[PDB]
Structures are given as C-alpha cells and as structure tokens.
Paper text:
We deleted this N-terminal transmembrane helix and included a His8-tag for purification purposes, resulting in soluble expression of SaNSR. SaNSR protein was crystallized and cubic crystals were obtained that diffracted up to 2.2 Å resolution. We solved the structure by Single Anomalous Dispersion (SAD) phasing, using crystals of selenomethionine-substituted protein (data and refinement statistics are shown in Table 1). The asymmetric unit contained four copies of SaNSR that were virtually identical (root mean square deviation (RMSD) between the monomers = 0.15–0.5 Å over 300 amino acids). A SaNSR monomer consists of eleven helices (α1-α11) and eleven β-strands (βa-βk), which form three domains: an N-terminal helical bundle and two protease subdomains. Altogether, these domains form a hydrophobic tunnel of ~10 Å width, which could very well harbor the nisin molecule. The protease core domain is formed by six strands βb-βg and five helices α5-α9. It contains the highly conserved TASSAEM region that harbors the previously identified catalytically active serine at position 23622. N-pep is predominantly bound to SaNSR via direct backbone interactions to amino acids 167NNTGGN172 of β-strand βd, which is part of the protease core domain and is structurally located on the opposite site of the TASSAEM sequence motif. The presence of N-pep within the tunnel is clearly an induced artifact of the crystallization procedure, since in the full-length SaNSR protein, another 30 amino acids are attached at the N-terminus of the N-pep sequence that form a transmembrane helix. Out of all residues of this helix, only the side chain of Asp110 is intruding into the tunnel, which neither forms an interaction to N-pep in the crystal structure nor in the NSRTail MD simulations. This suggests that the protease cap is not adopting a fully closed state, rather an intermediate state.
Author numbering: 31 to 317
Write the structure that this text describes.
Amino acid sequence: LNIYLLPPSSERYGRVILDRVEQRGLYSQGRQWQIIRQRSEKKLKTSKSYQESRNIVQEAVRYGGGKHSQILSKETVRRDTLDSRYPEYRRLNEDILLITIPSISKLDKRSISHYSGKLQNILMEKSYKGLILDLSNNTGGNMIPMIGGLASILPNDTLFHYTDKYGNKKTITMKNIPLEALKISRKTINTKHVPIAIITNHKTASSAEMTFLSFKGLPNVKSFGQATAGYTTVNETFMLYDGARLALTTGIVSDRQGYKYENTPILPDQVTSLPLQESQSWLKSRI
C-alpha cells in the first residue's frame, strides 16, 4: 500500500521518552531531575540507535518514575508475554478449594478471556464453603483478567484509589474493568460470599499487589504469608515507535481503608512461613 514513514532519529526517540517521563512520572521534577535529564540529552545527541537511546535514558526513567518504571524493548515485551500462565485449582476437601492465580501479561482477547473464564467457572460452578487464593510468585501483568476472573467475589464498587503528580485523585472500580471484553456479566459481580484466605509471598508484585489491595477490608477475607514485593504504584504504558514499551509510574495508591502505598510492601494479616497450613485452619474455624 501507499505508505509514508519518516521514523524519528535515535536522538528524537530518546527525547520522546524524556518528555513522557517528565509529563507523568511521579518524581520527574526539580533540581536533581534536570541534570539527570540534561546529562541524558547530552548523550542522546550522539546516539546511533534506538537501543542505545533506551540505554541512555535508563537513569532518567529510573529516577523520574522510580523502581516500578522501565523501558522494555519489543523483544523483552514478547518474551515476557510468553511467560503467561492460566489459573489452576485443587480441591483440598469437600469445603475448600485452593486456587492458584498466576502472572499473565497477555493482551489478546482470547487469552485473557480463557484466564478469567477459568476463574469464573471455578468460582461459579464448583461447590465449596471456603476459598484459598494463592498469589505467591504472581509478579503482575494484565489487571483485567485477574480482577475480572475474581469478579464474583469482589464488590461492585471502589477497588482502590490512585493519585497522580498533579494531585488528581482517581478510583479503580469494578466498572472501570472491561468485563464486557471477557464476556462476563456484571450480574455475577459480588455474588459469592464465603470466607476467603489470600496467600502472598515476597515475589507477589504489581498487578497482583493491586489485586490483593482490592480485597482489603472485606470482612470475610484474611491474608497469610509474607510481605509482598512492594510495587504498589500505578503505571501507564506508552508504546514507542519501534514496538518498545515505556512503563511509567504515575500514581500513588491507597486502599478502601485509607492506607497509603508507594512502592511499599503489603503486610498480610498473619505473617508466616506456613500460609497453606494456617490458611486451612483459619478457614475451618469460620466454616
């Protein structure tokens, strides 16, 4: 077809990332920020490729956005997509299901609907009186299939809040979740009410942590295990010219109860190295 393309220079490509970082990053203002930015622009003047430009702005991204921010090359983004897994369950006994809820980074509608659908089926069509939700080793990815699959046990209300560098406070509610895309019905939201035990470990991160926050303060819920990884900030992701992605931190976070998080670990209710064990016992007492 009839195509016109005049791709940015490697310098331009680098400067585009600096503009975004400055525009939305939590920390990208003030004396230390320029200097880092100025130093980055000086190197970019002689950059000879996009890859080189990403290397050059790395300090700026890390400073301007913090430890939850980064630039992923197109290749890195795809390899990470291929690490995606689907939820699994095992019946522990006639009353308790153990549900494994893993990392998934996929965007495509089919994959994310298979992930959420698997969860939906377990929660809606299986028999139980209590649940164990296992977020160990879930380092995040696409929030949509995670929150979506768990829709039946979450409020049709505020999930968590987040505030940007300009002091704009916003809210992620069950409505902001594209359930329609997963072909899941809003009539199923919050229709299961059983004791829920949630397990986390040190690797539990990011989307998984914000999924964890979405259960906080629920009276039927209690959590076991260890503090999470501490990537409790909202990111916005910007697709760059060659398919690379800028993941940029733009929001500080608070849960329904008013507690604030800024790349800070979440404490489970009951810290322990035996959370499956203590989980079941807790579930027994409440059943």
